Amino acid sequence: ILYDYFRSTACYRVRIALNLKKIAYEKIEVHLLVPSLDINGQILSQSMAIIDYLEEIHPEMPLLPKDPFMKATLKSMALIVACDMHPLNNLRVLNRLKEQFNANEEQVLEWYHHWLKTGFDAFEEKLGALERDKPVCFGSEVGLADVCLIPQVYNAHRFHFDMASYPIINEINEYCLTLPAFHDAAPEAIS
Amino acid sequence: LILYDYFRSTACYRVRIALNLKKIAYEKIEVVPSLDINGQILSQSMAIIDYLEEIHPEMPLLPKDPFMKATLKSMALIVACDMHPLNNLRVLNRLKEQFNANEEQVLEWYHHWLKTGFDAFEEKLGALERDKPVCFGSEVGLADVCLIPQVYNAHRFHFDMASYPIINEINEYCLTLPAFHDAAPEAI
C-alpha cells in the first residue's frame, strides 16, 4: 500500500521506483505523511528511505550499480536533488516566505529559480564526469539518480525555469520520459 | 583516504562520527564534507556514510531488519532533508539578500525548522523501544549520528529543547562516548 499525493515530487519518485522494479503495489490517493508505505500495518515515510527499502526486499531491477564507489556517487547525485534542491522549494517553504516576508509572485519565483540553478549546475557537473550508453545518468540502465531527476525537472518547467544550460540533463529527461515506468508515474497520469 | 572537513559543519560532524564508530583511520584536512578515496572524490554526507557502511560492514550503523533499517534511515532523513538544508548558511544569506531579513527574522526562520523537525523526530522516537539513550535498541546507529550534530546546531542557535526529553537523553548519552565526543567541533 502506497499512500499518494498526486502533486508531490517525493511521491513521483516513489511511483517511478515502484514501476522500474516492477513491484506489485496498491495506491491510495489522499490530499495533504506522503509518500508513506504501509507494510502489513507497518508504516514507513521518507521517499529515499522508502526506495532503499524496496531496493532491499526487491534486489531485482537494481536502481544502483554494484561498485561501492559508483553506487555512492549516484546516491549523492540523488541527494543533490532531494537535499540541496527540493527541500528549499517545498510548498511549506514558499508559504513561509509569504508569511514571514510577504513574498510577492516574482520573489517566490526568483527564490525558486535560484535553487534550481544551483542544483542543476551541480548535477550537470558530476553528470559530465560519467559515461553512458544512452541518456541515463550513468551506464546503460536507468537508476536512482534518474528516478530523482525526472520529478525535479518536471518542477522546473512547471515554474518555467529555462533548462538551456543543462544539455545532458535535458537529454536524460527526454529519454526517460519515453519509458512507461516514468510516463505512467507522472502526476497527469494519476488524473 | 582523505576527508576535507570543516570543524563546525554539522554535515562533516556526521561523517567524523561514523569514521570514529567504525574506527576507520583517515587523513583529515581542515579547509565539504568530501571523502577522497585514492584520488576519487565523493561528496554527499549521507552518500559518504553509506559508502563507509558498504565498504566497512562491521560496526553496522543500521539493524538487519529491512523495516527497522529503513525506519531509522527515514529518521536520519528527517534531519538531513527536512531540517539541515533549510537552515544552511547559503539559505540564511539568501533571506538577507532577497528579503533583507534581520537578525530576529533569520532566527524565527531557523527556529521554525528546528521545531518542525524535532517535533517529527521526537514523535517517531516515542514509537520505538530502547534499553539505553539511543534512537533504537541498545546500540548507536545512523539516526544517532545525524541527531547529535543537529542538536548541537539547536543549542548553538539558542533553541529551547525542553519539549524533546528523549532527544535530550540521547544527545547526553551519545556525547559520553568517545566516538561522538571526539568528533565534536570543540574537539576540532
Residue of A nearest to B101 (CA): A101
Which residues are B137's β-sheet partners? B130
What sign does the dihedral B183-B57-B46-B133 (CA atoms) show? negative
String of b and e for A27-49 (b: at least 16 CB within 10 Å)?
eeeeeeebbbbeeeeeebbbbbb
Pick the closest to residue B76 from B153, B163, B135, B132 (CA basis).
B135
Q: What is the DSSP string of A67-124?
A: SHHHHHHHHHHHHHHHHHTHHHHSHHHHHHHHHHH---HHHHHHHHHHHHHHHHHHHH
Residue A132, all three cell numbers: 553512458
Name residues whose C-beta falls within 8 Å of residue B41's C-beta, 6 or more positions apart in sequence. B34, B35
Which 8-state DSSP code applies to residue B1? -
Q: Does residue A96 sit at the B interface (CB-CB below 8 Å)?
A: yes
Phi, psi of A42 (to 5 degrees): -85, 120
Indicate the length of chain B as a whole number. Answer: 188
Query: Contact B85/A88, CB-based, under 8 Å?
Result: yes
What sign does the dihedral A171-A174-A175-A181 (CA atoms) show? positive
Q: Within 13 Å and on the Cβ side, how many CA atoms surround B181?
A: 7
Residue B64, all three cell numbers: 538487519
State in words which class domain A65-191 has.
mainly alpha
What CA–CA distance (Å, rounded) separates A130 from A58? 27
What CA–CA distance (Å, rounded) separates A134 from A6? 29
Domain residue limits, chain B:
3-58, 63-188
String of b and e for B94-129 (b: at least 16 CB within 10 Å)?
bbeeebebeeeebeebbbbbbeebbebbbebbeebe
Q: Within 13 Å and on the Cβ side, how many CA atoms surround A148?
A: 27
Which H or E element spans position B120? helix B103-125
**Sheet with strand A2-4: strands edge to edge:** A27-29, A2-4, A36-39, A42-45
What architecture does CATH give domain B3-58? 3-Layer(aba) Sandwich (3.40)
- Report the residue of B68, B99, B116 to disrupt the A interface, i.e. the one with the largest count of A CBs within 10 Å: B99
Contact, A74 vs A65, CB < 8 A? yes
Block residue for cell numbers 531557523 = B110
Residue B111, all three cell numbers: 527556529
What CA–CA distance (Å, rounded) separates A143 from A72? 12
Residue of B nearest to A47 (CA): B74
Residue numbers in B near A80 (CB within 8 A): 44
* Rg over CA atoms, chain A: 16
Contact, A89 vs A161, CB < 8 A? no
Residue A1, all three cell numbers: 500500500
Name residues whose C-beta falls within 8 Å of residue B79's C-beta, 6 or more positions apart in sequence. B117, B121, B146, B147, B150
> DSSP strand E in B17-155: where?
27-30, 34-37, 40-42
Q: Which amino acid appears at position B38 of this protein?
A: N
Which structural technique was applied? X-ray
Query: What's the CATH code, domain B63-188?
Result: 1.20.1050.10
Pick the closest to residue B73 from B154, B20, B129, B136 (CA basis).
B136
Residue numbers in A near B38 (CB within 8 A): none
Contact, A14 vs A51, CB < 8 A? yes
Which H or E element spans position A36? strand A36-39
What CA–CA distance (Å, rounded) separates A48 from A148? 9
Pick the closest to residue B105 from B96, B114, B97, B113 (CA basis).
B96
What CA–CA distance (Å, rounded) separates B41 from B35? 6
Nearest 5°: the CA angle A58, A64, A65 is: 120
What CA–CA distance (Å, rounded) separates B83 from B100? 22
Pick the closest to residue A144 from B19, B5, B44, B99 (CA basis).
B44
Domain topology for A2-60: Glutaredoxin (3.40.30)
Nearest 5°: the CA angle A90, A172, B54 is: 75
Which 8-state DSSP code applies to residue B130? B
Residue B148, burial from CB neighbour count under 10 angstroms (0-12, 13-18, 19+):
buried
What CA–CA distance (Å, rounded) separates A8 from A90? 9
- Report the residue of A67, A69, A114 to disrupt the B interface, i.e. the one with the largest count of B CBs within 10 Å: A69
Name residues whose C-beta falls within 8 Å of residue A187's C-beta, 6 or more positions apart in sequence. A6, A7, A12, A154
Contact, B70 vs A44, CB < 8 A? yes
Phi, psi of B169 (to 5 degrees): -65, -45
Query: Contact B108/A114, CB-based, under 8 Å?
Result: no
